[PDB]
Ligand binder design. Structure first.
Ligand code: KXP
Ligand code: ANP
Ligand code: NAG
Ligand code: NAG
Ligand code: NAG
Ligand code: NAG
Ligand code: NAG
Ligand code: NAG
Ligand code: CA
Ligand code: MG
Lengths: 214, 935
């Protein structure tokens, strides 16, 4: 088994200093063919050389760079050795919908996608009386799905009197936590009736003024 | 060849006589070469026309028509207002590629529409003018032939007022005088004669006399054809208004761009520290591009590109619709000048009367009949003499013809007073044929011509053996006093003395005149003839007459003019009458018309008094003397053709009254040339009008009615009104629009209305308001307002009150929405959106409300005079309804399926209903603002 010595894990802060990740193939009796860096199972571009010792430099480290890095060593007649250098950093929410407007008696969908590593734990909250409480499944109409980035909250058979409000994903991780908010509004069924009663109230007083004038 | 004859007649001098004598002799020596029989004439057969016109080629082809549709498009493209729009579209299209392109197309579309419409209407107008305006007295045959055909050899009969259609050698005639200023530039009356100057020229006007001509050639080789081939106060005010609006719009656009750039730079660089990194240069220029485009679009909104289109559309619509009202317009600017008309100087006969002469009263047998009598009532030995003295007296060509069409009246063809006399004779159950047939020119030798100088026509007949029989018809005052006996009683020849005739004048003549009857007198004489009388001394050869009977002819006043004149006087227009009849008859008819009312102080002075009282210093004409007459003058009797001209000149040029006067003159005749051109607008007569009076006028009346003139006045006022209402609507829109932009750049850092939406608003307002508000049909309410002044401003008080009130309502609603729409609708605020951001439905609501308010205010902008019932007459103009409904549907589709390119997000049903609610509220606010006194 080839021996690979790797650099220590790095926590990406707001500092602009470039970060260098190092692997050294210290012991190998096989004719090495090539080597490459990989991030989250994706081979980084232009990282294939001889590289019996291999380096990767990040000039502007950001939270989007952090991930589970590997330096894979492919040999002529030996199985590959991968190893792992984890680059930890706090998570950041990169995508959400500002508001969700839906008719009563319909479904609602909200999501909070984020970037970081190690991948976070998604929990949702609901703002009541000025403070954020935990979501409650007290009617079986709430569905929460959790993934690495994606989280999804779904509501069925919206109720105008209870559901509307602001919800908040929470994205926690050993480095830190981040959160954003989404406003859900449920529209009444009798909405298109009040303006109609207005329009009539303008016609039957626009006529009255005219015919009296004649 | 015609070329030799043309070169011969080109001399135009006293040498022509010599040449004609030295080479061509008289007319008949070489008339055979032209292939023409003078006395016999030409039947008018096609083979004869082909044989005599083997090398004619063609007639005078109409002008080349260099104005094609493409030429008109190019001409209308270089308009001052459209240059700005097309330049700005070019800048926008160039600046886009760096959906921005969707901006430029909008501007382009506007320009395209305008130019197309303009070109189309212009071309249409030209075709109409060619179609409407293209029997000639030069007939050849004894029967009249149509004007179109013109041949070489035809024998023209020329009368006073004929416009000469071709060139020809003179043959015979009496005292022919012609105005040749159309060719020489000299306005002196050339007297034509075989022995001095026998040529007759196309395009010259016959001022006096009559004759015949043998045309040298049909071929249009006359000097006038050769030279012709060789060849708006409202508009000024509107141009001034357009340039002022453009300047204000330019200033506002520049200020908006400066404010936006200042905000961006100060906020991004000074308040917050950000260095000018080169990598961010594209973003920093995209911002600038956006700001610039916003400014540009504001300018193209503020520029009024629909004003000239509105003017041309209203003028073309009115000109086309006048033709179905018996007015055909030649000069376009006369359509709107008639709106301001403040005086009309018409003539009695032809226009105010039906010009049909009938006999209703008589004074025969020393008895006054008010109705046509039985033939037995009148004693014998007198009826025969009356028939002899009427049938043979004058103008054997005044034949009476049956109508023979839909039971019409027996229209007359000759001198109308003599026609009425023949009608009276026929109504006595007699016939003039057994008298005229037995008396041809055979013994008819001594005839005195009829003219206004003598007002009488006399003939001598040789039939009485060893005697003569003089006949005379006179104006009851020139001729009546010349008689010496009365055929009264049972044929008795009582002695006529100055004593009893004075009482007779006040007994029968005065009541006849007061009934509106023109009084004429018939007299006869018998010369002994044993010594031949020397008949050249008119003073004595017309005396010693014997009056047979006195008859009063009449022509009824048209049934429509008593109300047309009333409408004219209600609309502030004063109408005067100029006539050649005696003062009594003129006053009697002017009372029936309504021109002068029985109780008032209105002058009715004659022509001689008029000339005497306006010339104090020798014969000089003084404006001060005229200014004391024309304000209170209604009837001008026994006038002269120059009297009408001097009255028009005195009225127009006067600076005495508080308001400048614009007059209209109705004319018909030879000498109504200068009087009909000094006036501001001239009306020629349709059927009774000569060619000289038709080529100097501005409008021609097809039906000859005076009541047509009033229609013209109405159709003038409508034109003005149309422009006014358009202006109203347009101004309101752009005011709000501009203000919104200038308040979007200060409170926020972006205009609430994007560039493409503002271009849609500009398209609606300018193009469609010009097309829809400028075709309003006229109503009878227009003829109830005093004529407008000269320096009256376009933006009247009510128009600016409407502009301010509706702008106030629209501005408050738009600002309230822009700042509280996130909470009123619960729709998430769209303010402070970053660059390249998805559209929101907070701003789509503002755009939709703006457009709906504009449409519901376009409905309001159809009333300028404070009228409350806006929907009055809305269905008489289908263009308005079509355009408004089409715009509404297009707005719906733009908001719904018109997303990211138009910056519009789809709306639900209640938001649409709220937008419509606010528009109808604009209608109700229009109702509110109408109940405010502008005084
Ligand atoms: C309305 O009130 O329209 C706005 C239209 O603005 C824009 O179109 C773009 C700018 C937006 C306006 C904002 C800020 C201002 O229009 P104007 O200022 O550019 O033109 C005025 C106006 O037409 C008056 O009504 C006339 O008044 P009158 O004819 O009665 O005399 C006056 O005529 P004059 O100077 O002789 O006095 C004109 O000059
Ligand atoms: N055939 C006629 N023979 C003799 N006198 C006539 C004849 N016709 C008209 N008169 C009279 O002689 C004058 C001729 O004037 P005329 O040319 O008919 O115009 P007017 O009637 O005077 N004016 P106007 O109605 O405007 O054309 C008038 O005084 C008539 O009364
Ligand atoms: C790099 O080159 C050395 C020297 O030839 C060789 O031993 C080694 O296997 C190579 N590694 C590769 C090609 O990955
Ligand atoms: C790791 O490899 C690099 C690159 O060759 C080398 O400089 C460094 O000394 C190596 N470190 C160790 C501990 O072998
Ligand atoms: C390398 O192989 C190991 C075997 O345990 C595996 O866990 C790891 O994910 C592999 N690395 C990559 C980048 O696939
Ligand atoms: C809520 O209860 C329903 C019905 O038992 C279940 O399907 C759903 O997954 C539950 N959701 C949560 C977040 O507990
Ligand atoms: C989330 O993880 C998936 C793999 O499941 C990856 O394809 C995607 O790029 C990640 N990020 C986002 C923002 O979806
Ligand atoms: C997420 O947890 C962190 C840590 O307390 C906090 O900053 C954030 O507000 C939390 N989220 C919610 C939804 O309360
Ligand atoms: Ca415009
Ligand atoms: Mg006359």
């Amino acid at each position: 088994k080839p021996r690979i010595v790797t650099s220590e894990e790095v926590i990406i802060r707001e500092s602009l200093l470039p970060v260098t990740l190092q692997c050294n193939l210290t012991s190998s009796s096989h004719t090495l063919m090539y080597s490459y860096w990989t991030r989250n199972g994706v081979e980084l571009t232009a990282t294939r050389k001889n590289a019996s010792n291999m380096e990767y430099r990040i000039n502007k480290p950001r939270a989007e760079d952090s991930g589970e890095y590997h330096c894979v060593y492919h040999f002529v007649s030996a199985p590959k050795a991968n190893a792992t250098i984890e680059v930890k950093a706090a998570p950041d929410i990169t995508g959400h919908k500002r508001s969700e407007n839906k008719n009563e008696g319909q479904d609602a969908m909200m999501y909070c996608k984020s970037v970081g590593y190690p991948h976070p734990e998604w929990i949702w909250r609901k703002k009541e009386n000025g403070v954020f409480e935990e979501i409650s499944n007290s009617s079986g109409r709430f569905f929460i799905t959790n993934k690495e980035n994606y989280t999804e909250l779904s509501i069925v058979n919206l109720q105008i009197t209870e559901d509307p409000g602001e919800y908040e994903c929470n994205a926690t991780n050993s480095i830190g936590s981040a959160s954003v908010s989404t406003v859900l509004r449920v529209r009444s069924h009798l909405a298109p009736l009040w303006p109609f009663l207005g329009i009539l109230a303008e016609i039957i007083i626009l006529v009255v003024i005219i015919v009296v004038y004649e | 060849t015609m070329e030799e004859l043309r070169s011969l007649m080109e001399l135009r001098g006293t040498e022509a006589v010599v040449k004609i004598k030295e080479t061509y002799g008289d007319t008949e020596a070489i008339c055979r070469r032209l292939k023409t029989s003078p006395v016999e004439g030409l039947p008018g057969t096609a083979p004869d026309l082909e044989k005599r016109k083997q090398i004619f080629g063609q007639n005078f082809i109409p002008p080349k028509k260099p104005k094609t549709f493409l030429q008109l498009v190019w001409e209308a493209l270089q308009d001052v207002t459209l240059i700005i729009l097309e330049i700005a579209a070019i800048i926008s299209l160039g600046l886009s590629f760096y959906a921005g392109w969707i901006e430029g197309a909008a501007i382009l579309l506007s320009v395209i529409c305008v130019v197309l419409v303009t070109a189309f209407n212009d071309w249409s107008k030209e075709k109409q003018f060619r179609g409407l305006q293209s029997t000639v007295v030069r007939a050849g045959q004894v029967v009249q032939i149509p004007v179109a055909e013109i041949v070489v050899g035809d024998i023209a009969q020329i009368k006073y007022g004929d416009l000469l259609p071709a060139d020809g050698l003179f043959i015979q005639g009496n005292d022919l005088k012609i105005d040749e200023s159309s060719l020489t530039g000299e306005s002196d009356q050339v007297r034509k004669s075989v022995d001095k100057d026998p040529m007759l020229l196309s395009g010259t006007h016959v001022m006096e006399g009559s004759g015949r001509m043998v045309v040298t050639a049909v071929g249009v080789n006359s000097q006038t054809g050769i030279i012709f081939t060789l060849l708006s106060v409202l508009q000024g005010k509107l141009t001034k208004l357009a340039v002022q609006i453009g300047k204000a719009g330019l200033v506002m656009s520049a200020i908006t761009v400066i404010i936006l750039v200042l905000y961006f730079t100060v906020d991004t660089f000074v308040v917050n520290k950000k260095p000018w990194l080169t990598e961010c240069t594209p973003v920093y220029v995209q911002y600038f591009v956006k700001f610039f485009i916003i400014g540009v679009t504001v300018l193209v909104v503020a520029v009024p590109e629909g004003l000239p289109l509105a003017v041309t559309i209203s003028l073309a619509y009115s000109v086309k619709k006048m033709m179905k009202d018996n007015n055909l317009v030649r000069h376009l600017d006369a359509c709107e000048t008639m709106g301001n008309a403040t005086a009309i100087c018409s003539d009695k006969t032809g226009t105010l009367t039906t010009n049909r002469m009938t006999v209703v009263q008589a004074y025969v047998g020393d008895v006054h009949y008010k109705e046509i009598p039985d033939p037995s009532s009148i004693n014998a030995k007198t009826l025969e003499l009356l028939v002899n003295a009427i049938a043979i007296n004058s103008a054997y060509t005044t034949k009476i013809l049956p109508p023979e069409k839909e039971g019409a009246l027996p229209r007359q063809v000759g001198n109308k007073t003599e026609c009425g006399l023949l009608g009276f004779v026929l109504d006595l159950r007699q016939d003039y044929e057994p008298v005229r047939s037995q008396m041809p020119e055979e013994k008819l030798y001594k005839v005195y011509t009829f003219n206004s100088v003598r007002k009488s026509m006399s003939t001598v007949i040789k039939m009485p053996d060893e005697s003569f029989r003089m006949y005379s018809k006179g104006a009851s005052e020139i001729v009546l006093k010349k008689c010496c006996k009365i055929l009264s009683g049972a044929g008795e020849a009582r002695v006529f003395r100055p004593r009893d005739r004075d009482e007779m004048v006040k007994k029968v003549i005065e009541p006849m005149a007061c009934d509106g009857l023109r009084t004429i007198c018939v007299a006869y004489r018998d010369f002994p003839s044993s010594p031949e009388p020397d008949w050249d001394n008119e003073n004595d050869i017309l005396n010693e007459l014997t009056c047979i009977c006195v008859v009063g002819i009449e022509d009824p006043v048209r049934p429509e003019v008593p109300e047309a004149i009333r409408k004219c006087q209600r609309a502030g227009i004063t109408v005067r009458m100029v006539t050649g009849d005696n003062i009594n008859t003129a006053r009697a008819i002017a009372i029936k018309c309504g021109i002068i009312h029985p109780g008032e102080d209105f002058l009715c002075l004659e022509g001689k008094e008029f000339n005497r009282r306006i010339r104090n210093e020798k014969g000089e004409i003084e404006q001060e003397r005229i200014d004391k007459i024309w304000p209170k003058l209604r009837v001008l009797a026994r006038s002269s053709p120059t009297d009408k001209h001097t009255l028009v000149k005195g009225i127009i040029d006067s600076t005495h009254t508080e308001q400048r006067q614009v007059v209209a003159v109705t004319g018909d005749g030879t000498n109504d040339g200068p009087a009909l051109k000094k006036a501001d607008v001239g009306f020629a007569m349709g059927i009774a009008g000569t060619d000289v009076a038709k080529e100097a006028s501005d409008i021609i009346l097809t039906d000859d009615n005076f009541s047509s003139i009033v229609k013209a006045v109405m159709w003038g006022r409508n034109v003005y009104d149309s422009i006014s209402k358009f202006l109203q609507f347009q101004l309101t829109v752009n005011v709000v629009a501009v203000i919104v932009a200038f308040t979007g750049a200060c409170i926020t850092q972006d205009s609430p209305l994007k560039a493409v939406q503002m271009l849609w608003v500009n398209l609606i307002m300018d193009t469609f308001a010009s097309l829809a508000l400028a075709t309003e049909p006229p109503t009878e309410t227009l003829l109830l307002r005093k004529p407008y002044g000269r320096n009256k401003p376009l933006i009247s008080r009510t128009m600016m009150k409407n502009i301010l009130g509706h702008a106030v309502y629209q501005l408050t609603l738009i600002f309230t929405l822009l700042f509280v729409g996130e909470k009123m609708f619960q729709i998430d605020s769209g303010r402070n959106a970053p660059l390249h951001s998805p559209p929101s439905e907070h701003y789509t609501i503002i755009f939709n409300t703006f457009v709906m308010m504009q449409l519901f205010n376009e409905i309001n902008a159809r009333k300028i005079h404070g009228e409350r019932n806006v929907f009055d007459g809305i269905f008489r103009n289908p263009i308005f309804c079509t355009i408004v409904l089409g715009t509404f549907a297009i707005q719906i589709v733009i908001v719904q399926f018109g997303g990211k390119p138009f910056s519009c997000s789809p709306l639900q049903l209640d938001q649409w209903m709220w937008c419509i609610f606010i528009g109808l509220g604009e209608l109700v606010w229009g109702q509110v603002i109408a109940t405010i006194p502008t005084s």
